[PDB]
């Protein structure tokens, strides 16, 4: 069968890296 | 909560620093 | 007509609170890492007293700049950490602003 | 506060509580295409258009700068051919 | 961008203005025995109080034992029957004759907006610190009279203790 | 039908107003002046 699922490696405490910029009108 | 409601929020308001004169000063800093 | 320094000094005291401008300001390098930016930080330290403290429209931001001094012996590492710690630790800090002032 | 005595509103007219129709005398036109008679009973059979005003006239309608002299002329000369 | 950059004097100043700005006021007070910008290092002294006492931000102005209202209760009094009197009288005018029904609608709203104003002078902050204070009171109460209970009903027990070992002796 | 809606609306408001001048007369006496005053700046 399989010997063994993964264990679960969630980081949420990445701050992630998306540019904001186009935000003024 | 859908209806944004203006100058009371819990936060400083994005829109209310861009809307600040603090934008247009940052902008005419050379002006400064 | 052109703003005092006044008004720019308290506009960015109270914008400090933002999470999204802590975040955004911690995340480019040489902002953390000239020293003029801190110096300004801790220059700020004296707007805790009256009546200058009158003037403030949001206190949470006097914690958070004390809670960037803290930051300038911690250390950016915890950059990441900061949404979840002020997320979690608002009730406390509220609290103790509640007892700094409403007392 | 707002109690003006010299503030007076008058009935509107026409009174709606009043018979409307018998205000000016016209009921004849009304009791003439009336729904029903006095009786109750229907009085012509009711249909939409305009056709039946014109069955009277000879037909069968099932579905439904100038120079005259000249143009009788050219008519005339069209046929005669 | 989204974020506004930081102030321009921010940069200016090193930690060697920082431990010079001593010497330097002490310098510009010497000397001085809207302020122009002669030196890179004005901003450091404390900027002063504007004389008028104002401030104004986004449109707006801003700037002791503590630390006749019968008249306006009575003027509220009738305010509110002149206003209950009001909306009988436009829904009377809503019966009758609707199509000028606004021409009394806007008035009664006055009165409300009087009401309002009405609140303003009445205007709470005295009445929370009053409340607040008797709540805390009453606690503080409450704890002491429940600490000379307990310690009386433990005098009590020694007392009644002594007088059993006395008679045991 | 238009018109038999205003009739009867009519009643209604008539009845409405009526019975509220006739309460706020009981109640309140020292206002039942003005009221019938309303009456008079109504009908």
Known sequence: ?25 | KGAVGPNNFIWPAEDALRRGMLAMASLHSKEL | ?103 | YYVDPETTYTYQQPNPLQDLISVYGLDDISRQVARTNLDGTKAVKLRKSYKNQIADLSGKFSTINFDWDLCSSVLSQFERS | ?169 | ?43
């Open chain 1, 1 to 25: 069968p399989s010997y063994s699922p993964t264990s679960p490696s969630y980081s949420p405490t990445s701050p992630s890296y998306s540019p904001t910029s186009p935000s003024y009108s």
């Open chain 5, 1 to 169: 961008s989204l974020y506004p950059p930081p102030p321009p004097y921010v940069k200016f100043f090193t930690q060697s203005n920082l431990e010079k700005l001593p010497k330097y006021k002490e310098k510009k007070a010497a000397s001085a025995k809207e302020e122009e910008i002669t030196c890179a290092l004005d901003y450091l002294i404390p900027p002063p109080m504007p004389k008028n006492q104002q401030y104004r931000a986004f449109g707006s102005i801003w700037q002791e034992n503590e630390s006749n209202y019968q008249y306006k209760i009575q003027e509220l009094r009738k305010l509110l029957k002149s206003l209950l009197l009001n909306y009988l009288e436009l829904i009377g005018v809503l019966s009758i004759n609707p199509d000028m029904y606004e021409r009394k609608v806007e008035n009664i709203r006055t009165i409300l907006v009087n009401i309002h104003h009405l609140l303003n002078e009445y205007r709470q902050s005295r009445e929370s610190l009053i409340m607040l204070l008797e709540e805390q009171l009453e606690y503080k109460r409450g704890e002491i009279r429940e600490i000379e209970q307990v310690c009386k009903q433990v005098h009590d027990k020694l007392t009644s203790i002594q007088d059993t070992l006395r008679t045991g002796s």
């Open chain 6, 1 to 43: 039908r238009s018109n038999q809606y205003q009739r009867g609306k009519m009643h209604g408001l008539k009845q409405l107003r009526d019975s509220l001048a006739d309460k706020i007369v009981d109640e309140f006496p020292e206002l039942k002046e003005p009221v019938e005053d309303i009456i008079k700046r109504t009908s």
């Open chain 3, 1 to 103: 007509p052109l703003p005092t320094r006044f008004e720019v000094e308290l506009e960015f005291i109270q914008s400090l609170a933002n999470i999204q401008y802590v975040t955004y300001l911690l995340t480019q390098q040489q902002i953390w890492k000239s020293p003029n930016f801190k110096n300004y930080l801790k220059y700020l330290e004296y707007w805790c007293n009256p009546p200058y403290s009158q003037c403030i429209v949001y206190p949470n931001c006097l914690f958070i700049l004390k809670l960037l001094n803290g930051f300038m012996e911690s250390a950016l590492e915890g950059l990441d950490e900061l949404p979840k710690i002020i997320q979690l630790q608002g009730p406390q800090w509220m609290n103790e602003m509640v007892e700094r002032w409403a007392n």
